[PDB]
Design a protein around this ligand. Structure first.
Ligand SMILES: CCCCCCCCCCCCCCCCCC(=O)OC[C@H](COP(=O)([O-])OCC(O)COP(=O)([O-])OC[C@@H](COC(=O)CCCCCCCCCCCCCCCCC)OC(=O)CCCCCCCCCCCCCCCCC)OC(=O)CCCCCCCCCCCCCCCCC
Ligand SMILES: COC1=C(OC)C(=O)C(C/C=C(\C)CC/C=C(/C)CC/C=C(/C)CC/C=C(\C)CC/C=C(/C)CC/C=C(\C)CC/C=C(\C)CC/C=C(\C)CC/C=C(/C)CCC=C(C)C)=C(C)C1=O
Ligand SMILES: CCCCCCCCCCCCCCCCCC(=O)OC[C@H](COP(=O)([O-])OCC[N+](C)(C)C)OC(=O)CCCCCCCCCCCCCCCCC
Ligand SMILES: CCCCCCCCCCCCCCCCCC(=O)OC[C@H](COP(=O)(O)OCCN)OC(=O)CCCCCCCCCCCCCCCCC
Ligand SMILES: Nc1nc2c(ncn2[C@@H]2O[C@H](COP(=O)(O)OP(=O)(O)OP(=O)(O)O)[C@@H](O)[C@H]2O)c(=O)[nH]1
Lengths: 115, 60, 98, 49, 59, 139, 120, 320, 347
C-alpha cells in the first residue's frame, strides 16, 4: 500500500515526463539526421564491435568482493550477541580475508588494471 | 563344399563371431560419433529428465 | 502447498529448460543458470521465513555467496573462449571433437 | 667417471638409507612387541591367564 | 623369424577413430601438442579517428 | 508403467485385439523414445525430414509391437495354451522379419528372427516363473 | 553386513573389545603372503628405475616388506574383528528370535521317499 | 636435488640471475661460411658460453662417456654419403635431416638449461628456426620427398612452439663462388661434389624466409665474411642492442620456472621427435629395433642407471 | 602455474571432497561440491590450450547444472520434511532429482557425454585427478542415501553406464578417451551394486582407484596419448610396457588378477538377493571392455611395433621425474585376490 503507492507515484510521474518529452516537440523527420556522430564524423563501422578490454579483472573482482560485503553486512545485528568474543574473532577473520584477497590481487598484478 | 568352407569357414564363423562383431561394429559408431556440440548433449539430458520424471515415473 | 510455491517451482522448471535447452548463446545460458539460483534462493527463503527456522535464516545468503562465485568463474570462462574464438555462440565450440 | 655428468644416485645417500633401516627396525620391534602384548592381553582377558 | 606388424598394420588404427564408417572420415586427428594451429588473427587495435570537429584541439 | 499394465492385464488369447492394441501403444512408446533420442542427439536439416525420421522410427516400432501382440494372442488361442514360450517366440521374431523388411534387408530380419524371438521367449519365461530383471534390495 | 551398529566409535581402526579375539599369529599364511606382497613391490621398484632388479638398494626392499607386513597385521585383526562381530550378533539375533528359526526335525533316509531316476 | 617445485618454493628464482649477459645468439649462413669462427670469437669476446654445431653425434657428446657411437647405433645416416648419393632415397637424405633437426633441438634444450641455471648468454650455430632452410633446399633438388617435408614442418610446429626464440642472430652472408672456393680450400672429399644449385638454394631459403620470419621476434644483424673475420665490430654492436622485441623481454619468473622444468628433463624435450607417424625412411623395422636394442643394452653404462652399473665399476649397490 | 598456487589448488580440491564425506548438514555437502568444482577448473586449465578451455567449459556447465539440481533436491526434501540431515528422503521426486544431479557429476546415464570429452581436453595428470578423486564425493553421498533410492532407477542407470562405457571405447584410439570410457564402465559397475550393499561398491571404488593410478602413472611414465604413440614406446620402456600389459589384463577382470575380485564380489551379492538376470549383463558386457583392452595390449607389448630412427637418441636419456608410489601402485592393483576377506574391514 503506502510504500507501493510511493513507488507507483514516482514511476508514473517519470513516465509522464518522458511522454511529454518524446511526444510534445515536432520534428521534420529527414533522413540525414540519422547519420551517427563522433566529434564531427560518424563512428565509422564500430560502436558495436566486441570490446577487446583488460579491466574485466577489476569488474569480476568487484563481484567477488561484493559477496564478502554481503557476508559482513549482518554485523550491526551480530554485535548484539552474548558470546561477543567469538563474534569479534570471526568478524576479524572475515575482514582479514578481505585484506588477504586484496593483497593477493595486488602483488599478483590482478587489481593492477591489466595492460 | 559342405564340411569345410561352407560350414566351418562360412557359416559358424558368420553366426556367432562375425555377426556379434558386426553388431558391435554397427553400435559402436552410432554410440561414439557425437560431434561435440553442447546443445544436442544437453537436450539428451533434457528428454532423459522427463523419461526419468514422468514417462517411466521413477518416483511412482 | 499454495500458489507461491507453484510459481517459484514452475519458474525453476522453465529456468532448467531455458539454460539446459541451449538455443545458441553461452552467455545467455549461464544467465539462465544464475536465474535458476535466484528461483532457488526465493524458494529457500520462503520455508525458512515461514517455519521460524531462525538459524536457517543465514542459509540463503550462504547459498547466495557460493552461487555467484559459480557465475564469477562462468563469465570468467566466457571471456577465455571469447578472445580466441571470437564470440560466445556455441556452434563453433567444436574443436574438441575426438 | 664414464658419464661426465655426476650420476644422480652415484653416491651412497647415507641419511636416507639410515632412516630406512631405522624405520624397518622400528616397525619390526613395534610389531613383535604388539603381538606379545595382544597375546598376553587375550589370555588375561578371557580367563586363560 | 616370426612376423611383426608391418607399417600398414600400425596404419589401420591411425586415423583418429580406427573403426570408421562414413562421417568419421571428416574427423582429423588432433595435433601432438594438443594445441590447435592458431586461428585467424584477431589482433586489432580498434582505429579511432578522434575528430575532426573535436573542439578540444583548439577546434 | 500403466501402459505396460495395459498389456499385463489382458491375458494371452482372450481378447486378442485389445492386447494387440496395447502392444501397438508400447511399441509406439519405445518408438517415440528412440525418435526423441534421434531427433535430439542427431541433428536434422528441416522440420519435415526430422518428423519423417520420427515417423519412420515410430511406424517401425509400432509394426513390431502390433504383429507381436496379435500373433501372440492368436497363438495363445488356437493352441489354447497361453503359457508357452513359443507363443511369444513366433510373434516376437516375425517382428524381427517385419523390422528387416522395414529396413529393406531380409538378412538382418533373419538374424532378428533369432534374437527378437529368443528375447520374447525369455521375457515370457520370466513372467511365468517370476524372474526379476530389477530385483529389490532384499538381503 | 554394519555401519549403524550401536556404540560404534568412528574413525577407530581397532576397537578395544577386539583384543578378546586371538591376535593373528606372526606366521599366519595370509600375513606371510602379504610379506611376500612386499617383495613384489620392491622388485618392481628397481625395474621401473631400470636399477638392478635383484639387489638394488636392499634398504628400499626392507621398508617395502616391513611396512606391508605391518599394515597387513593390523588389517588382519580388524578382518577377524568384523567377522567375529558378524558371527557374534549372529547368534544373539538367533537366540533372541527363536520363532524365526524353527527347530527343523531330522528324519533319516529310511523315512524320506526320494525317488531314484534311472539314468540310461 | 635438481630444480624441482621445492626449488621454486624455497626461493630459487631465475630472474635474480638474468642480466645483459644472457643473450641467445646464433651464427647462421651458408655451408662453411666461417660462422663457426664468428661464434667462437663472439663467445670469447663477450664471456658467452660457446656451443659447437650439433651434428650426427650430439647425443653421445651430451650423454654417456662423450665418445661417438656407431652410425647404425646413432643416426643410421651419413652426410658424407648424402653428398655421395642424394638421389638414391634409401633414407639418408631425410633421415639425416631429421636427426640433425632433433640434435639441434637437444642443443637448444641444453643451451636454455645452461642459461636458466647459470645466467650466461649462449651462442649456437643454427637452431630450430634455422635448419628448415636446408631441407627446403634439399627438397628443391628433389633429395627429399614431399611427405617427408610436410612431416618435418609438422614436427617443427609441434616442437618449436614451446621454445621462445634467440635474442639476435648473426648471418654470415657469403656469395656462392666464395663458398665453393672455401669448400675447395677445406680438403675433405665428401664436401666437394656439392651442387651450386643447392649452395645458392639454401641461400635463398635463408634470405627470403629465415630473416623475415625471424626478424619480428628477434633482431637481425646479417654480416659478410669481410666483416666476420673482424671480432671487434661484430661484438661491439651486439653489445649495443636494445633486445626489446620478442617473448624474451616479456616473460616473468613463472615462465622461467616452466621452461627450466621442461629443459632440465630432456626426455620430454624431444618427446615429439619420436615421430608418431609412419613414413618409409623414418620408420625402423621392429626386428631391427629389437636387434639394435640387444646391441645397445649391453653397451657399458647403458643397461642400469648411472651410479648403478656394476659392469663399469660402481660401488655400494646393495645399499644404493 | 605457481607451485604454491598449484598446491593450494590440490588441497582445496581435497578439502572440498573431505567436507563432502565428513559433513552431515546437506548445505555443507553442496558447499563441498562447489568448493571442489571451483577448485578443479583452474588445474584443468594449467596447460592453457584451447582444448583445455573446451574441456573446462564443458565440465563447468555440466557440474554447475548438476549442483543446481542438487540444491533442488535439497530444497524439496527440506520443504517436505524440514530436516537438513542427510538420511532417507521423505519425498520421492526429491530422491530422483538428487539421483540425476549426482549422476551428472559421475557420468553414468546419458549425463556422461562430458567425461570422454573433458578427458580428451586436459593433460593426463589432470585426467588422473578427474577420473580418480572427483568420484569419491558423489559416491559418498550416494552411499549415505542408499536407504531410499529407486532400485529401478539406479539399476538401469548403471546398466547404460557400463553399456555405453563398453561400446564407446571400441572406436577410440586416444588413450585418454578409452580410459574415460573404461571409467564409465567401472562407474556402472559400482553403481549397480550401490543400492544392495555399499561395502562392495566401496571395494570396487578402491580397486578401480588403485588401478587408475597404476594406469595413468604408467601413461605419463611413457608419455603417450595415442595408441600409435604408446606402440612406439614398446622400445624405450620394455618393463613399463610389460607392466602396461599386466595391468591391462587386470582391467577386464581375468583371474587371478585384482580386477576380477570386484566383479566376483558384486555378482555374488547380486545373486544373494535374487538378482540373477542382472549380473549376467555386465558379465557379458565386460568383454566389450576386454576388447579394446586387448587392442591396447597388442599395440603395447604383445606385438612389436615399427619404431622411428630419431627415437634412438631417446635411449640416451632417463626419466628423471620419479613419480613415486608406482611400484606398490601396480602391485596392489595386480595381486590382492588372496586377500579378498579383507573386504570385511571396510564394513
Ligand atoms: C592411495 C592414496 C595415495 C595415492 C598416491 C599416488 C597417486 C597420487 C598422484 C601421484 C603421486 C606421485 C607423483 O609424482 O606425484 C607428483 C606428480 C608431479 O606433479 P604434476 O602436477 O604431475 O607435474 C608438475 C610437477 O609437480 C612440477 O611442479 P609444479 O610446480 O608444476 O607443481 C607443484 C607440485 C607440488 O609442488 C610442491 O612443492 C608440493 O604439484 C603437484 O605435485 C600436483 C598436486 C598438487 C600439489 C601437491 C600437493 C599434493 C598433496 O603428479 C602426479 O603424479 C599427478 C598430479 C596430481 C597429484 C595429486 C593427486 C591426488 C589425487 C589422486 C588420487 C589419490 C587417491 C584417492 C583415493
Ligand atoms: C586551446 O585549447 C582548447 C581546448 O583543447 C585543446 C579545449 O578543450 C577547449 C574547450 C573548452 C571549453 C568549451 C570550455 C568551456 C567553458 C565554459 C565557460 C562553458 C561551460 C560553463 C560551465 C559553468 C560548465 C557547466 C557544466 C557543468 C555544470 C557540468 C558539465 C557536464 C554535464 C553533463 C552538463 C552538460 C550539459 C547539459 C546536461 C545541459 C544542461 C541541461 C539543463 C540545465 C536542464 C535543466 C532542466 C530543468 C531545470 C528541469 C526542471 C524545470 C522546472 C521549471 C522545474 C519546475 C517544473 C515542474 C514540472 C515541477 C578550448 C576552448 C580550448 O581553447
Ligand atoms: C587387499 C584386498 C582387500 C582390500 C580391502 C581394502 C584394503 C585397503 C583399505 C584399507 C584401509 C582403509 C579402511 C580402514 C581404515 O583405514 O579405517 C577404517 C575405519 C574408518 O572409520 P569409519 O569406518 O568410522 O568411517 C568410514 C566408514 N565407511 C567405510 C563406511 C565409509 O576405521 C575405524 O576405526 C572404523 C570405525 C568404524 C567401523 C565400522
Ligand atoms: C608376464 C609378462 C608379460 C609381458 C610379456 C611380453 C613382454 C616381454 C618383454 C618385452 C621386451 C623385451 C626386452 O628386451 O625386455 C627387456 C626388459 C628389461 O630387461 P631385464 O631387466 O632383464 O628384465 C627382467 C628383470 N631383470 O625386460 C622385460 O621387458 C621382461 C619383462 C619385465 C617385467 C616382468 C614381467 C611382468 C611382471 C608383472
Ligand atoms: N642436411 C643438412 N646439413 C646441415 C644442416 N646444418 C648443417 N649442415 C651441414 O653441416 C656441415 C658443416 O657446416 P659449416 O659448419 O657451415 O661448415 P664448415 O666447413 O665446418 O665451416 P664453418 O662454417 O666455418 O664451421 C655442412 O656439411 C652442412 O651442410 C642442416 O640443417 N641440414
Amino acid at each position: 500500500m503506502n510504500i507501493m503507492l510511493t513507488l507507483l507515484t514516482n514511476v508514473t510521474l517519470a513516465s509522464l515526463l518522458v511522454l511529454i518529452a518524446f511526444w510534445l516537440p515536432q520534428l521534420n523527420a529527414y533522413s540525414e539526421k540519422t547519420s551517427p556522430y563522433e566529434c564531427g564524423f560518424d563512428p565509422m563501422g564500430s560502436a558495436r564491435l566486441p570490446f577487446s578490454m583488460k579491466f574485466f579483472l577489476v569488474a569480476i573482482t568487484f563481484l567477488l568482493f561484493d559477496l564478502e560485503i554481503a557476508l559482513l553486512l549482518p554485523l550491526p545485528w551480530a554485535s548484539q550477541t552474548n558470546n561477543l568474543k567469538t563474534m569479534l574473532t570471526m568478524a576479524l577473520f572475515l575482514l582479514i580475508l578481505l585484506a588477504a584477497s586484496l593483497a593477493y590481487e595486488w602483488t599478483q598484478k590482478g587489481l593492477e588494471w591489466a595492460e | 563344399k559342405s564340411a569345410s568352407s561352407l560350414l566351418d569357414l562360412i557359416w559358424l564363423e558368420t553366426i556367432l563371431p562375425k555377426t556379434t562383431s558386426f553388431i558391435q561394429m554397427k553400435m559402436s559408431i552410432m554410440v561414439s560419433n557425437q560431434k561435440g556440440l553442447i546443445k544436442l548433449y544437453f537436450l539428451s539430458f533434457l528428454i532423459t529428465i522427463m523419461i526419468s520424471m514422468t514417462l517411466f515415473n521413477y518416483h511412482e | 502447498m499454495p500458489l507461491v510455491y507453484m510459481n517459484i517451482i514452475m519458474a525453476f522448471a522453465i529456468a532448467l529448460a531455458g539454460l539446459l535447452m541451449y538455443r545458441s548463446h553461452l552467455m545467455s545460458s549461464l544467465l539462465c543458470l544464475e536465474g535458476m539460483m535466484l528461483s532457488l534462493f526465493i524458494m529457500s527463503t520462503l520455508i525458512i521465513l515461514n517455519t521460524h527456522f531462525t538459524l536457517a535464516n543465514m542459509m540463503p545468503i550462504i547459498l547466495l555467496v557460493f552461487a555467484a562465485c559459480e557465475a564469477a568463474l562462468g563469465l570468467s570462462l566466457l571471456v577465455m573462449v571469447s578472445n580466441t574464438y571470437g564470440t560466445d555462440y556455441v556452434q563453433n565450440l567444436n574443436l574438441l571433437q575426438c | 667417471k664414464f658419464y661426465i655428468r655426476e650420476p644422480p644416485h652415484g653416491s651412497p645417500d647415507w641419511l636416507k638409507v639410515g632412516l630406512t633401516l631405522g624405520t624397518s627396525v622400528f616397525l619390526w620391534i613395534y610389531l613383535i612387541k604388539q603381538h606379545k602384548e595382544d597375546v598376553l592381553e587375550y589370555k588375561r582377558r578371557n580367563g586363560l591367564e | 623369424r616370426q612376423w611383426q606388424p608391418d607399417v600398414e598394420w600400425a596404419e589401420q588404427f591411425g586415423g583418429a577413430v580406427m573403426y570408421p564408417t562414413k562421417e568419421t572420415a571428416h574427423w582429423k586427428p588432433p595435433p601432438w601438442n594438443d594445441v590447435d594451429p592458431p586461428k585467424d588473427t584477431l589482433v586489432s587495435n580498434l582505429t579511432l579517428n578522434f575528430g575532426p570537429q573535436h573542439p578540444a584541439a583548439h577546434g | 508403467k500403466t501402459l505396460l499394465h495395459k498389456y499385463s492385464d489382458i491375458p494371452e488369447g482372450t481378447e486378442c485385439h485389445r492386447k494387440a492394441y496395447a502392444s501397438t501403444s508400447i511399441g509406439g512408446a519405445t518408438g517415440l523414445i528412440v525418435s526423441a533420442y534421434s531427433i535430439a542427439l542427431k541433428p536434422p536439416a528441416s522440420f519435415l525430414e526430422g518428423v519423417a525420421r520420427t515417423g519412420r522410427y515410430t511406424f517401425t516400432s509400432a509394426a513390431i509391437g502390433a504383429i507381436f501382440g496379435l500373433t501372440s494372442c492368436i497363438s495363445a488361442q488356437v493352441r489354447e495354451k497361453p503359457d508357452d514360450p513359443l507363443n511369444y517366440f513366433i510373434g516376437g521374431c516375425a517382428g524381427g522379419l517385419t523390422l528387416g523388411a522395414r529396413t529393406r534387408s531380409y538378412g538382418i530380419g533373419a538374424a532378428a528372427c533369432a534374437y527378437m524371438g529368443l528375447t520374447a521367449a525369455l521375457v515370457k519365461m520370466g513372467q511365468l516363473e517370476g524372474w526379476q530383471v530389477f530385483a529389490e534390495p532384499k538381503v | 553386513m554394519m555401519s549403524g551398529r550401536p556404540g560404534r566409535v568412528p574413525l577407530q581402526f581397532l576397537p578395544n573389545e577386539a583384543r578378546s579375539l586371538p591376535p593373528p599369529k606372526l606366521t599366519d599364511p595370509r600375513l606371510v603372503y602379504m610379506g611376500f606382497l612386499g617383495y613384489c613391490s620392491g622388485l618392481i621398484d628397481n625395474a621401473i628405475r631400470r636399477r638392478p632388479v635383484v639387489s638394488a638398494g636392499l634398504h628400499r626392499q626392507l621398508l617395502y616388506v616391513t611396512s606391508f607386513v605391518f599394515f597387513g597385521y593390523y588389517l588382519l585383526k580388524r578382518q577377524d574383528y568384523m567377522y567375529a562381530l558378524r558371527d557374534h550378533d549372529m547368534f544373539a539375533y538367533v537366540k533372541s528370535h527363536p520363532e524365526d528359526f524353527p527347530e527343523k526335525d531330522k528324519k533319516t533316509y529310511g523315512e524320506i521317499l526320494e525317488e531314484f531316476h534311472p539314468v540310461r | 636435488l635438481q630444480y624441482g617445485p621445492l626449488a621454486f618454493v624455497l626461493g630459487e628464482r631465475t630472474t635474480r640471475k638474468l642480466t645483459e649477459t644472457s643473450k641467445v645468439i646464433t651464427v647462421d649462413g651458408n655451408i662453411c661460411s666461417g660462422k663457426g669462427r664468428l661464434a667462437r670469437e663472439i663467445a670469447e669476446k663477450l664471456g658467452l658460453r660457446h656451443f659447437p654445431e650439433a651434428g650426427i653425434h650430439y647425443a653421445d657428446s651430451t650423454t654417456g662417456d662423450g665418445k661417438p657411437l656407431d652410425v647404425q647405433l646413432s643416426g643410421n645416416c651419413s652426410l658424407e654419403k648424402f653428398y655421395d648419393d642424394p638421389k638414391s632415397n634409401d633414407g639418408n637424405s631425410y633421415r639425416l635431416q631429421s636427426w640433425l633437426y632433433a640434435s639441434r633441438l637437444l642443443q637448444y634444450a641444453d643451451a636454455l638449461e645452461h642459461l636458466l641455471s647459470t645466467g650466461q648468454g649462449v651462442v649456437l650455430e643454427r637452431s630450430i628456426y634455422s635448419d628448415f632452410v636446408f631441407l627446403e633446399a634439399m627438397y628443391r633438388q628433389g633429395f627429399i620427398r614431399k611427405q617427408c617435408v610436410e612431416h618435418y614442418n609438422e614436427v617443427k610446429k609441434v616442437t618449436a612452439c614451446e621454445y621462445l626464440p634467440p635474442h639476435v642472430v648473426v648471418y654470415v652472408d657469403v656469395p656462392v663462388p666464395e663458398i665453393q672456393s672455401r669448400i675447395q680450400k677445406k680438403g675433405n672429399p665428401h664436401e666437394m661434389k656439392i651442387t651450386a644449385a643447392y649452395l645458392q638454394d639454401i641461400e635463398n631459403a635463408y634470405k627470403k624466409t629465415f630473416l623475415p620470419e625471424m626478424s619480428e621476434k628477434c633482431e637481425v644483424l646479417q654480416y659478410s665474411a669481410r666483416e666476420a673475420e673482424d671480432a671487434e665490430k661484430v661484438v661491439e654492436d651486439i653489445e649495443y642492442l636494445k633486445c626489446d622485441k620478442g617473448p624474451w623481454p616479456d616473460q616473468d619468473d613463472r615462465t622461467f620456472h616452466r621452461l627450466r622444468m621442461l629443459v632440465q628433463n630432456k626426455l620430454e624435450v624431444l618427446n615429439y621427435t619420436t615421430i608418431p607417424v609412419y613414413l618409409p625412411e623414418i620408420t625402423i623395422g621392429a626386428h631391427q629395433s629389437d636387434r639394435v636394442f640387444q646391441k645397445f643394452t649391453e653397451l657399458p653404462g647403458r643397461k642400469y642407471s648411472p651410479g648403478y652399473n656394476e659392469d663399469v665399476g660402481d660401488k655400494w649397490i646393495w645399499l644404493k | 602455474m605457481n607451485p604454491i598456487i598449484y598446491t593450494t589448488l590440490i588441497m582445496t580440491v581435497m578439502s572440498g571432497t573431505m567436507l563432502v564425506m565428513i559433513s552431515s548438514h546437506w548445505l555443507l555437502i553442496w558447499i563441498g561440491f562447489e568448493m571442489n568444482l571451483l577448485a578443479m577448473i583452474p588445474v584443468l586449465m594449467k596447460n592453457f590450450n584451447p582444448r583445455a578451455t573446451e574441456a573446462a567449459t564443458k565440465y563447468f556447465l555440466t557440474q554447475a547444472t548438476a549442483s543446481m539440481m542438487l540444491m533442488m533436491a535439497i530444497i524439496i526434501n527440506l520443504l517436505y520434511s524440514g530436516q537438513w540431515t542427510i538420511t532417507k528422503m521423505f519425498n520421492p521426486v526429491a530422491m530422483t532429482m538428487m539421483t540425476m544431479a549426482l549422476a551428472m557429476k559421475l557420468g553414468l546415464s546419458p549425463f556422461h557425454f562430458w567425461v570422454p570429452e573433458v578427458t580428451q581436453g586436459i593433460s593426463l595428470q589432470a585426467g588422473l585427478l578427474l577420473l580418480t578423486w572427483q568420484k569419491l564425493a558423489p559416491l559418498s553421498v550416494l552411499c549415505q542415501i542408499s536407504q531410499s533410492i529407486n532400485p529401478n532407477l539406479m539399476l538401469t542407470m548403471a546398466m547404460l553406464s557400463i553399456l555405453i562405457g563398453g561400446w564407446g571405447g571400441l572406436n577410440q584410439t586416444q588413450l585418454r578417451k578409452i580410459m574415460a570410457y573404461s571409467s564409465i564402465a567401472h562407474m556402472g559397475w559400482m553403481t549397480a551394486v550401490l543400492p544392495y550393499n555399499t561395502t562392495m561398491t566401496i571395494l570396487n571404488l578402491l580397486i578401480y582407484i588403485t588401478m587408475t593410478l597404476a594406469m595413468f602413472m604408467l601413461l605419463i611414465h611413457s608419455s603417450a596419448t595415442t595408441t600409435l604413440s604408446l606402440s612406439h614406446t614398446w622400445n624405450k620402456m620394455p618393463v613399463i610396457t610389460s607392466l602396461m600389459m599386466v595391468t591391462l589384463l587386470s582391467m577386464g577382470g581375468l583371474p587371478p588378477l585384482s580386477g576380477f575380485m570386484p566383479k566376483w564380489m558384486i555378482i555374488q551379492e547380486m545373486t544373494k538377493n535374487e538378482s540373477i538376470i542382472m549380473p549376467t549383463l555386465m558379465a557379458m558386457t565386460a568383454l566389450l571392455n576386454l576388447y579394446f583392452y586387448m587392442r591396447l595390449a597388442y599395440s603395447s607389448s604383445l606385438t612389436m611395433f615399427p619404431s622411428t630412427n630419431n627415437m634412438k637418441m631417446k635411449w640416451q636419456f632417463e626419466h628423471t621425474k620419479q613419480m613415486k608410489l608406482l611400484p606398490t601402485m601396480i602391485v596392489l592393483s595386480t595381486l590382492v585376490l588372496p586377500m579378498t576377506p579383507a573386504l570385511s574391514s571396510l564394513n
